[PDB]
Design a binder for this molecule. Structure first.
Ligand SMILES: NC(=O)c1ccc[n+]([C@@H]2O[C@H](COP(=O)([O-])OP(=O)(O)OC[C@H]3O[C@@H](n4cnc5c(N)ncnc54)[C@H](O)[C@@H]3O)[C@@H](O)[C@H]2O)c1
Ligand SMILES: NC(=O)c1ccc[n+]([C@@H]2O[C@H](COP(=O)([O-])OP(=O)(O)OC[C@H]3O[C@@H](n4cnc5c(N)ncnc54)[C@H](O)[C@@H]3O)[C@@H](O)[C@H]2O)c1
Ligand SMILES: NC(=O)c1ccc[n+]([C@@H]2O[C@H](COP(=O)([O-])OP(=O)(O)OC[C@H]3O[C@@H](n4cnc5c(N)ncnc54)[C@H](O)[C@@H]3O)[C@@H](O)[C@H]2O)c1
Ligand SMILES: NC(=O)c1ccc[n+]([C@@H]2O[C@H](COP(=O)([O-])OP(=O)(O)OC[C@H]3O[C@@H](n4cnc5c(N)ncnc54)[C@H](O)[C@@H]3O)[C@@H](O)[C@H]2O)c1
Ligand SMILES: Cc1cc(CNC(=O)c2cc(CSc3nc(C)cc(C)n3)on2)ccn1
Ligand SMILES: Cc1cc(CNC(=O)c2cc(CSc3nc(C)cc(C)n3)on2)ccn1
Ligand SMILES: Cc1cc(CNC(=O)c2cc(CSc3nc(C)cc(C)n3)on2)ccn1
Ligand SMILES: Cc1cc(CNC(=O)c2cc(CSc3nc(C)cc(C)n3)on2)ccn1
Lengths: 249, 267, 264, 261
């Protein structure tokens, strides 16, 4: 008798057992969901990580930069869940920015080819995934993506912050399309998770604190959006950040 | 096996069976919550309405402008739920603005005594309720208030919009205090719902105020990617129950929009 | 050949020569404006401005002062003349609502007084003065970014959230007269009151909390922030009073060194 | 005695005399600024347009997708304004999105190559221009870019709206770098401007309703034919009168974004 009992949910973005997607998948299975997982490049490695989950789930390859992977995705999901069955949820937990665009590298030294790759994977793909999967989603369905509050600039995050600002915009347009299918589209803006000064300021600002080593409160928030309990929320952002973004000091 | 099984929750703001609080109370009871209800002024009338809920719940009087009611509230709640027991949730579903501060009356013609009364009830009382109830709340607890997105000005709502802007600010300060108890504080920003006063304004009780409200409501369902039904409070009640649950444990001082996604779209 | 040459502007809120309104008035006069001042002992401070200006009494909690204001201004500027600008630089919150006092311990009578003066009066002033304002005119109020909660500011932060909402409604009314209404959100300024807190008037704990809040502003601001200098704020107000932001109304301009745009 | 007397300002983005940049250049010259103009591809056509400005100004070629044009830009500007002189202002008034990403085409049918080109020109180039020009900018200087409020989704604008969301984020990072030079960076978010039945009946009606809603929402109204209030706002940011504003957005939209109805 779980929160997601009988729901068929696709979860992308598992690479390690510290991945936010790994925790989303674990909580969803604990809550009765039947999962379909997608992984990128290191599929044998990802399959071994998926063996750590409480229940067995099919693993499909999905490189969001590969248009053939996207064109075949719905058919491959249908084969995994069975003909006549549709998805109730989709989790986009994919992000990438080359070292030139995120870290110590000066903001101005990131070449556009690197930034474009990062934007393709971190923002445009949220629209690609919705385009591929909306034709196989049930009404009352839910699409959830992962965000990192980009409303204010900050050190090091640089072009990944720019990619998240683009993602938030993409999410609002995806909600317009998803609405035609009776499907919601939302992002969960998480605080920093270990998957230093800027990061420690989070626990200080958060009225309920913030534990960077614990992805479970973020996974629970994603599951709340996948459930039938936020039925009037779409094109929106839910902050699972300890309330840090609501406080200056 | 409900979403709020075994939770003790205080729900304020029931006046009619169209009240958002009535629907919050109904959904919470359907989901296994044990309620304590608070009502203002028309207690015999409220008791007749609360009899329509799926389960019996104690009804306590609470006028948020009454210091004595606030000073005795925690003790009265403890008597209702039993000594040694504490609340897991609190719902503030209280709002008021005199006629001078809403509708057709010009924005500039609202006297400050009327505006102040509206702000006391609609915004300051969210802090009063939290002050009175945090000492009797369990860790992991949740305080939820009702909001109407005041980020942009709109016709007729006038000083009620101003009161909601103040409420959003109060919520962020309440979260700082509630955090000390391991309690979350958040607001649910709902789209327009046909409750007692909303139906009267739409019916013109001035022509202009109702016509502007009519265009505002029509636009809401148009802008909402999933549509918006003003006659249905259940999606709003479900959203409040999600915040009262253990499923949004890292959200505080925040606003969740249960508005069909209308605020995310220009047209 | 100043930015505000020939403009007739009302400036409220001068109490000391450290008042933001004192600097706004000074810069406006330097830029060719003809002022009318309102105060609520102030004449000796207003005499320190570069040019002579009539001083009118205005207690924003006094309905009679508000009812007579337009008539008194017309008498000061001469029959047939109207105002081009209005500056609201008024704010108040009792000690129970801001400072060391717990957020929960502020009685509503104190909060309501603070909201009356700091937020509602922006609407009162616009109601009184719009009938004597020229098209292309400008109303400007002072704000302190209340988007996120912070220590000590407490109910003054709540009053500013209310003021931002009031400004958006005032813009609707002012638009009917071809008048703009905007707020300038300033970073913290070392006014007579603020310098005392730094010195230790609030005590060790809150004095350190406020110092972190202040050091953080200059750190976050890409161009830095000088709390001892009100001139960048006065210049921003004058930009809004000018003809150079003709399509901005119901809005907030941040004169805060860009601090509100940065997390760290 | 003008608002920008003696200031040396670079203005990019003139293509026609309806371009917002044409109006920014005109107002800045009326206010005493000495300009350097940059144009893309159709330079002869651009020269004919810039002949219509009140004063003569050097025109430099700048394709923001061309790394060689960006690498040589500072040197070429220095040659135009004279050695030992620096810029006081920079105006980025550049935008592009292919027809697959903006207009009638479904949001989902825009290929990434088209979206990426649009993002390169409309958002990333704001950072490229700042990188090239900050070494030749004076303290107290100002960089201004053009925005269209992307806080809420809307019909047709689609991936251009996404590019503007990216641009607003880029501006906040550019402000961090510009601050090291004592230079401000800000965007002006304009209401819709009629620059240079084409969309059909359905799309044409939705775009007209979207565009007309601005004048209705704006407390002071909005004139879609007139770029001058937008040009004046840009010049206010280029002036010394907003010295404490950076990484920010000034709305020159009649106040439409502050009203729901
Ligand atoms: N870690 C944090 O502090 C934090 C904070 C807020 C939000 N987020 C977001 O959460 C999401 C998950 O990140 P994470 O922290 O779990 O990191 P992660 O490294 O564990 O996950 C990122 C995933 O993206 C996948 N990916 C990269 N390129 C891909 C491609 N071409 N096709 C498909 N998938 C591809 C990777 O294989 C990986 O599984 C991201 O969107 C991230 O930005 C993370
Ligand atoms: N109806 C809408 O369109 C709408 C939209 C968004 C949010 N909301 C908010 O939802 C909440 C509930 O409103 P509703 O629409 O159900 O209307 P309602 O009239 O049914 O409920 C308002 C409640 O406030 C109570 N109240 C007033 N003065 C009080 C006092 N002094 N002490 C205690 N309680 C007092 C009333 O007795 C009533 O129970 C309010 O905060 C309202 O602003 C309503
Ligand atoms: N750090 C700061 O000082 C700071 C930061 C941002 C914004 N602001 C705002 O700037 C404005 C000016 O404040 P300041 O810092 O110059 O302080 P101040 O004390 O010099 O000015 C406040 C003024 O309000 C006046 N006032 C109070 N009650 C009044 C009443 N009933 N009627 C009329 N006037 C009344 C006082 O007489 C005084 O002139 C306020 O709105 C304030 O909130 C200040
Ligand atoms: N027109 C409106 O309704 C509106 C509204 C808000 C903001 N804006 C913005 O204002 C700016 C100017 O747009 P406009 O309306 O004047 O249109 P426009 O077509 O006249 O100007 C766009 C300019 O971008 C230039 N450009 C395109 N590709 C380029 C490249 N590779 N290198 C260099 N420059 C390149 C073009 O040559 C042209 O001069 C843009 O940023 C636009 O998004 C326009
Ligand atoms: C090859 C290489 C690349 C990098 C830079 N970043 C990533 O690879 C990278 C990892 C991720 C996961 S997405 C993400 N998103 C946020 C908001 C924070 C974090 C830590 N990861 O994205 N990009 C550094 C060193 N070596
Ligand atoms: C004669 C008369 C008096 C009033 C006074 N206001 C209320 O009763 C009142 C009721 C409520 C419920 S709270 C609320 N909140 C929003 C956002 C909208 C509405 C209509 N009500 O607020 N004010 C109104 C109409 N006609
Ligand atoms: C020592 C002490 C005294 C008070 C009484 N209020 C003021 O002095 C007062 C002055 C003002 C001017 S408005 C203002 N606004 C901001 C945002 C900051 C400051 C310092 N003053 O308002 N209230 C309150 C707290 N602590
Ligand atoms: C028929 C058609 C053609 C295109 C090709 N792009 C442009 O003409 C073009 C011109 C511009 C200038 S930037 C701009 N920015 C905004 C916010 C609005 C407009 C109309 N142009 O950008 N792309 C696109 C859409 N529909």
């Amino acid at each position: 008798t779980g929160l997601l009992d009988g729901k068929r949910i696709l979860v992308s973005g598992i690479i390690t057992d510290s991945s936010i997607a790994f925790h989303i998948a674990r909580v969803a299975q604990e809550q009765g969901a039947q999962l379909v997982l997608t992984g990128f490049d290191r599929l044998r490695l990802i399959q071994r990580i998926t063996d750590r989950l409480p229940a067995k789930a099919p693993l499909l390859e999905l490189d969001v930069q590969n248009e053939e992977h996207l064109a075949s995705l719905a058919g491959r999901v249908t084969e995994a869940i069975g003909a006549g069955n549709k998805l109730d949820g989709v989790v986009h937990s994919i992000g990438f920015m080359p070292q030139t665009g995120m870290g110590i590298n000066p903001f101005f030294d990131a070449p556009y080819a690197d930034v474009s790759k990062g934007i393709h994977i971190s923002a445009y793909s949220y629209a690609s995934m919705a385009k591929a999967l909306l034709p196989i989603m049930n009404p009352g369905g839910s699409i959830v993506g992962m965000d990192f509050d980009p409303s204010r600039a900050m050190p090091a995050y640089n072009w990944m912050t720019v990619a998240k600002s683009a993602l938030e915009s993409v999410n609002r347009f995806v909600a317009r399309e998803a609405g035609k299918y009776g499907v919601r589209s939302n992002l969960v803006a998480a605080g920093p998770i270990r998957t230093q000064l800027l990061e420690e300021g989070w626990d200080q600002r958060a009225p309920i604190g913030w534990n960077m080593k614990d992805a479970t409160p973020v996974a629970k928030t994603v599951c709340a959006l996948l459930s039938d309990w936020l039925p009037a929320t779409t094109g929106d952002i839910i902050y699972a950040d300890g309330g840090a973004h609501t406080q200056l000091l």
